[PDB]
Ligand binder design. Structure first.
Ligand SMILES: [Mg+2]
Ligand SMILES: [Mg+2]
Ligand SMILES: [Mg+2]
Lengths: 447, 449, 452, 452
C-alpha cells in the first residue's frame, strides 16, 4: 500500500545510453548495483508486489495483465547482444540507428528450431505485438505493448573491466513493419526462416528519457488501458491517438553538433558590426566578384586564425556565376610533416535577413573530391535545413555568415588602413579583383 | 654576316623549358630576344641570323616549307598550337587534353564541317598524316626523317599584376605521334557531322633540365645537313626513340611529379645521431608490442597535428587484438572556434625495421578507408617507399606521412617536455596508460565525441 | 556484248563507291540501276546494285529485306540484310515499341515484323525468320561461321530538302552496317486495336567505318559475287567488321560507331514533340502529380527501375524516404553490377520533382542529390520538366554520376509501362502510385539496401 | 464412386500441402501418388499430384515438362511448367552453357532444349515452345493475361545423404516458383561433337514465398482444376505472385527471393571443382600467364568485359594502362548506365594479377585498386587465385565498389568465351592476347574513356 504509493509518486527516468546493471538474482529494492543503476529495480520496484521483468537475450515479456474489462501485454523487453563494430560481419545483425530513431531488429528463430516461424516464444510475442502496432483504431493501439530496447554495452568506470555485466537502454519503440526473412547459418550452411522488424524509436520530448512508471501503470491490473498513459511519452500518446501518420513527427532525432539560428549567425541589432555588415551588403550587392575576392581574404583569415597554414590560390571567374568562386589550400600537419588540402570557396552576397538554402551549399559540397574541404561566405545566414544537411551527412564545409564576415572585415580594417574602413573595400573593388586563373583547383597543390 | 651571324646563332643554345611563357605577336621581329617582359617567339624559333623565314604559330597545325637535304627531303618540324583554354568552361568532346605530367597529349585536327572531302583535305591534317607515317616508322631512317611536333598553348599571363588573355603562348614540349585515329564530330552551331583526325602524342623527357634547345630546329631546317646530322642539339630521349623505336617510348616519355620525393635517407635519422639510437630503442621495444606502438603513434600524430597550432582531438584505438586497416581515430577542427568543421582522421601504426620501407599497397589500405572530408596518417619506424610517395603525390591522396625521423624527433620532444626524463617512462606509459581499447565505435562518431 | 558486259563488270569492280552515314538517297521502286543520281540525290538502286554488275535489285520495302541466297564456291551465303525503318517521326511516335536510333553511340534498337494477326510463335514471319537466321551467324562460334554472317545495312525513311522546300517521301538515309548484338523475346500492344502479340527485340551495334564514316558498296558486290568465297569478300569491308569476324563477341565492345557531340540537351530536346502523344501524357502527369508529391516519388522510383532495366542493368526495388515532408533523397534502389557469379551492389539514390514541363531544374537542385552520393553510389533525377544548361554543364565537367530523366524520357517510359502492364490505362498506374506510396516508405539508411 | 471421390478431393483440398526451397524429394517415375514418403524422403508424385484428386502425374522428365492444358469455364490455361535441372557438377561441368543458380538472390539462368540435331528455328522443340508460349503470358499486358501465366516450378537433381549413405540419382530439390524475367536468343557449342546450334536463354526471377520460404502446392491443384477460373486460383498462391499478377513488370524488382547470408567465400568456393574442366582450364591459364603479365591484363580486360555484359549492360572497351612495368590499375573500361537518352558513363578501373590458384589476394592489394576510385567509378579485380577472407570482409564492411573475379569465375568465363568465339580453341584466345596486348595500350587518363 504505502510502498506501492511511494513507488507511484517517484519518477523513474531512464535515458537513452544509461548503462544499467543486469544480473542474476539481485534485489528489486536497491536503486543502484555495482556502481550502476539496477535494472530489476528500474523495471520492477518490488513495492508493487509484481514479478521481475526478465531481460534475456532476444525478446522478453512478463505475464499478461488481466485488467477489469480487458487483458493486455504490459511491455516487450528486447535485449540485443552483438557489439561488433566491424568485428563480426553478418547481414542478419541488428542495425541500430538511434540518431534517426530507427532500429532493424531480427527474430529469435534459430537454425536448430523445429517449428515454423514464429512458433518460438519471441517471434510469437513479436507477431502478437505487431498485430496491435498496426492497428487502425485507437483501442487496438492502446493495447499495443511498447518495445523497450536494451543492448550489451561496454563501460569502464574505474578504467577496467568494461566488457560484460551491463545493459544499455536504447528507448521505447513502435513496430512499423514486420517481415519474414530467410537466413543461412554460416556454420552449417543451413537456410532457415526468421522474422525481422522495422522499429521506430519515439522521442522523449522534453527530455531524452522515459519514465518507467509507465510500465508500472501498464502492469497494473486495476487500471484499464486508457488510464495507463499518464507517464507515457507525449509522442507515444500521439501515436495512440493519430496512428501511423503521426510517426514521422514523433520519431526521435539527434544531431551530432549544435545548430545556430539566424540570430546567432547575425551580429547584434544595434552594434557597429551590424552597420558594418549593412555597409558591406550595400557595397557588394552589385559587386559580386569583388565580394568573392573579399570572401577569399576572409576565408584565408578564418583558416589562419585556427592555426592552419592557408594558401590563397586564385579566383575562378570574372563572369558567369559558377559553383566555385575562389580556391585555397591548407597544409594540414607540422612543418615538413604535412599534407595538402584543396579548399573550394563560394561567395554569396544576399540581404542579411535572407538565408542560404541547403542546395546552394550542396552546390559547393558536390565539387569536393577526397582530401578537399569547402568554405561558404555570406552576408546573410544559413537555413536550418542547410546546417542539418551538413551536420547529419558530415559535409566538410566551413560556414562564414554575416557575423563572422563582419568581424573579420572589421579586424582587417584595423589591420591595414589609414584610419578609415574603406581601405579593404577599395582594395577589393579596384586593382587585384580583375585577375583570374584558368587552372584546375587541385593544381593549387603545385603552387 | 651571311656566316658570322649564322655562326653566332649556331654557337648559342636556346633552351626552352616546359611552362615557359612566350610572346607571340602578329608581324613580330626575329631579332628581338625579350618582348614585353616575355621571350619573343619568332626570335626563339628563328633567330634571324640564319636568314630563314620565321616559323609561324597560328592557332592549330603549322609547318615551314620542306627542307630538301643533300640526299633526302624532310619536314623540319610541325608547330602545334592548341586553340581553346579558359578553366573549362570549354565543354566539348573534341577538346584537346593536356596531361604533361605523364607526357600525354590528345590533340584534335583542323578538319571543318564545311570542309569538302575526307581527312586530311585540309593542309594541317595532311601534315598530320604525312608526319604520322614517319612517326610509325619501323626503320631508323623513317624515324630519322620524322618531324618533331612542338606544342604550344594559349595562356593567360600576368605581367606586373595585370591579366592578359591573348598575345601569349606556352611551350609544352616536343612530342611523338604514338597514335592516329579517325573520329566523327558534331558541330553545335552546324548540327552536321564531319570527319576529323585524333592524335595520341607522347611528350618526350628533356632530362633533368626539362627543356629543348631550339638549335635542333635550326639543324633540321638546314638544307646542307642530312637527317643523320641534325641530332646534336636534340634531347637524348628523342635520339633514343629514333635509334630504338616504339619500345623506347614508355621509358623516354615525360614524367613530372607535383612535389618532391624524400629518399629513405631523408626520412631516417642521421647516422650517429641521438634520434637514431632513439629510433633503434623504439623499434627494439615495439617489435613485440603492436598495440602499444599504436597508442604511441596516436600520441605522436596528435602532437604533430598540434604543432602547427591546428585544433586536434584524440579519440580511441580500433582493436586491442587482431589485424585491420585502421588503428586509431582522431579529429581536426577546421575553421574558427565554435563554428569550425570536424575532419575525421584515420591513423595506422606499423612498427617495422628502420631500414625497411612501407609499400604503396599497405598505404592504400588506409587511403581506401577515407570518405569525403576525411584524412589519414601513417606512422612507422621505417620509411615510405618511393612508389608509395609517387602514388600519394600523383593520385592526390590526403595522407600525412610520419616516418622514422619524424617519429624519433617528436618522441624525443615528447619525452623532453611531458615526461621530463628518459624514454623509459613514456614507453611504460604506452603500455599502462592505454594501448588497450576493444571499443565498438564508428569513425564518424568522433564528430560528437 | 560479252566484252561490254565483262569490261563493265570489271569497271564497277575497280571503282569504289563510298556511302557515308547520313547520306540522303533517292528510293524509287521502279528506278533503274544505271543513273548514279536521281531527283537531285544518289539513286539507291545504282548504289546497291549498279547496272554494270548485271545483278538483280536489292529491294528495300518496308521492314526487313534480303536478296536471294548466293551459292559460293566454298558454301552458300546470305549477302546482306537491308532494313528500312519508319517513321521515327521526330518524337511524335504513338507506338511505344518504335525503332530507337542512337547513331552517336552506334546502337540501334530494332523490332521485328511480327504482327497482331500473326498466328504462331516468332519468327513465323519472313522478317523475323531472316533475323533469326542472321542471329545464328552474328553469334557464330568460329571465324568461319562469322564469315557467312550477313551485314545489317540500316536505312530510315527521312525528309530531305530540295530547292529550299521539304520533301517528305521518296528518300532513305543510310545509318551504317550493324551487328546483331542481342536478340530477345518481347510482348507488344497495339494502342489502336488493343491487341497484344509476341515479337523480337534486337540490340544492334553499328560498326565504326574506320578511315571513313561509311562503307564501300563493293563489299556487298563481293558478298553477292558467286565467284568469290565468303572469305574472299572482306577486301572492301570495314576494318571493324574484319576484326569482328576474327574475334567475335570480344570485338563488339570496341567496334561501335562513335560521334563526339555535345552532351548538353536543350529544354526542347528533353521535352517530347509539340502535339505528340507523349506530350499529352506528360501534361496529364504534371496536372495529376501537381499536388501529389510522394505518389510522384513512387512513380519516379518505378520509372527509374524501368529505365535501368532497359539498359540490361539488374535493378532491385528499395523504398521511399517518407510519406510526408521533403528531403534531398526521395527514394532508394540498388543495381547489381557484374554477372550472376561475380557482382557488386551499387546504391541508387533517387530524387523526384514535379514542376511545370516548361520549367527547368537548377544546378543546385541536382547538386543536392549529387552531394549525398558516395563512391559506389549513383543518382537519378526524375522530373516532368527539363534540366538547365548550367546543371548539365556542371554534371559533365565535374563528372557527376547521376542519371537524368526529364519530361520526354518520363513520358515515353510511363507510356511503355502502361501499355505493357495495364492495357494502356494510365489511371491504373497513377491510382496505384496514389494508393501504394505510403506503404513503400521505410526509415532505413540507403546502405541497408545492400541487405535486400 | 462419386461421393468417395468428392470426399477424397475435399480432404486433399482441405489440408495445406507445403514445400520449401531446398527440400529434397524422392523422384521415382514409376512410383505411386498415394504414399506420402518414399525411401526416406517426401514422395514427389504425392506432393505434386496426390491420389485423392484423381489427377494424372505431373511428370518430371529431364528438361521442360508441362501437364495438359486446363479448360476452365473462362479460358483455357497451362497448369504449370515443371523444370528439372539435371547436371550435378559442383563445378565439374563440361558444358559452358549449363543452368546457373543464384537462389540467394532469386535469380536463375536457364537454357532451352534445342539440340544440334534439331532442324528449324527456336523453338521447334516442345520445351522451347512451352517456354515461349509461357513467356507470352509472363509478359502479359493485362492482369487477365498474367492470370493465365503458368508458374515455372524449378527442380534441381541433387545428390542426397541419408545417415551416411550418399545417393547420386533419384532425388530432386525444389528451387522455387519463377517468373520469366527475360528470354533471348543464344548460340551454343557442344564440346563433345563440336557442333554449334541456336537455343533460348532465360533469366528467371524466383519469387519470395513471404510467410513461408516455399509454396503451398494447393495453388497448382487449383490451377489444375477445370471447375475454377484463372482468377479463382490465387487463394493459395504466394502474395508476391498475386502482386505480380496485379502490377506486372513493375513487381519483378521487388518480389525476388532473398536469403540473408555472408558474401564471404572461402578459397574453395572461389576455386573451381577439383576434377572440373574449369580446374584444368585455370591450370592452363596459370601455366601460360605465369610469365605473361600484360597479356593476362588484356585477357582480364576481355573477361571483365564479358562479365559486365551478361546482364546486358552497355560495357565500352577502354584500354590497357601499361605495356611494361607495374601499377595500381591495369586496364580501363566504361559502363553507360540506365538512361539511354542522356546516358551516364561509369569509369571502370581494372586490375589483373596472376598468382598461384591456391594462393589468395590480400586486402592491401585490393585497396590499392579501390583507392584510385572516384565517385561514380567502379573497380574490378581479376586473378587466377582467390581473395583472402580479410580482403572480402574489408570490401563488405567498407562497401568497396569492386567486382571480384577469382579462379573459378575466370576459368568458367574464359571457357565460355573460347567455346563461343574460337571453336573451343583456348590457344586462339591466349595467342590473341599475346599478339594484341601491346597495341591495346594507351597513355590516357581513365576519365578520357568517356570520349569513347
Ligand atoms: Mg598496423
Ligand atoms: Mg523530390
Ligand atoms: Mg596487375
Amino acid at each position: 500500500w504505502a510502498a506501492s504509493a511511494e513507488v507511484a509518486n517517484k519518477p523513474r527516468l531512464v535515458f537513452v545510453g544509461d548503462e544499467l546493471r543486469y544480473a542474476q538474482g539481485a534485489n528489486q529494492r536497491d536503486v543502484e548495483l555495482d556502481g550502476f543503476v539496477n535494472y530489476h529495480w528500474l523495471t520492477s520496484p518490488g513495492g508493487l508486489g509484481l514479478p521481475k521483468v526478465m531481460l534475456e537475450a532476444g525478446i522478453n515479456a512478463p505475464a499478461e495483465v488481466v485488467g477489469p474489462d480487458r487483458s493486455r501485454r504490459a511491455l516487450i523487453a528486447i535485449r540485443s547482444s552483438p557489439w561488433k563494430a566491424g568485428h563480426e560481419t553478418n547481414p542478419w545483425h541488428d542495425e541500430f540507428d538511434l540518431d534517426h530513431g530507427h532500429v532493424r531488429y531480427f527474430g529469435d528463430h534459430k537454425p536448430s528450431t523445429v517449428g515454423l516461424p514464429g512458433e518460438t516464444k519471441g517471434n510469437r510475442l513479436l507477431l502478437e505485438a505487431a498485430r496491435l502496432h498496426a492497428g487502425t483504431t485507437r483501442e487496438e493501439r492502446l493495447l499495443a505493448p511498447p518495445l523497450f530496447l536494451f543492448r550489451a554495452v561496454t563501460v569502464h568506470r574505474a578504467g577496467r573491466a568494461v566488457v560484460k555485466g551491463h545493459v544499455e537502454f536504447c528507448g521505447a519503440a513502435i513496430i512499423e513493419r514486420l517481415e519474414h526473412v530467410v537466413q543461412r547459418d554460416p556454420e552449417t550452411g543451413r537456410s532457415f526462416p526468421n522474422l525481422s522488424l522495422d522499429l521506430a524509436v519515439v522521442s522523449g520530448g522534453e527530455i531524452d528519457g522515459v519514465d518507467f512508471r509507465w510500465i508500472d501503470d501498464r502492469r497494473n491490473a486495476a487500471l484499464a488501458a486508457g488510464e495507463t498513459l499518464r507517464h507515457a511519452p507525449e509522442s507515444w500518446i500521439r501515436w495512440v491517438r493519430q496512428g501511423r501518420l503521426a510517426i514521422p513527427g514523433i520519431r526521435r532525432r539527434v544531431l551530432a553538433s549544435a545548430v545556430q539560428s539566424s540570430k546567432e549567425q547575425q551580429p547584434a541589432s544595434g552594434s557597429a558590426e551590424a552597420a558594418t555588415l549593412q555597409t558591406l551588403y550595400k557595397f557588394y550587392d552589385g559587386r559580386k566578384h569583388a565580394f568573392e575576392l573579399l570572401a577569399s581574404r576572409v576565408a584565408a583569415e578564418v583558416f589562419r586564425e585556427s592555426g592552419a597554414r592557408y594558401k590563397e590560390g586564385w579566383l575562378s571567374r570574372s563572369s558567369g556565376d559558377g559553383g566555385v568562386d575562389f580556391i585555397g589550400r591548407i597544409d594540414m600537419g607540422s612543418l615538413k610533416a604535412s599534407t595538402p588540402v584543396v579548399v573550394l570557396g563560394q561567395a554569396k552576397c544576399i540581404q542579411p535577413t535572407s538565408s542560404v538554402s541547403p542546395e546552394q551549399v550542396a552546390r559547393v559540397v558536390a565539387r569536393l573530391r577526397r582530401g578537399w574541404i569547402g568554405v561558404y561566405v555570406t552576408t546573410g545566414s544559413f537555413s536550418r535545413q542547410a546546417q542539418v544537411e551538413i551536420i547529419d551527412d558530415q559535409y566538410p564545409v566551413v560556414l562564414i555568415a554575416g557575423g563572422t564576415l563582419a568581424a573579420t572585415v572589421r579586424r582587417m580594417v584595423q589591420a591595414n588602413y589609414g584610419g578609415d574602413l574603406d581601405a579593404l573595400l577599395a582594395s577589393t573593388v579596384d586593382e587585384y579583383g580583375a585577375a583570374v586563373t584558368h587552372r584546375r583547383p587541385e593544381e593549387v597543390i603545385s603552387l
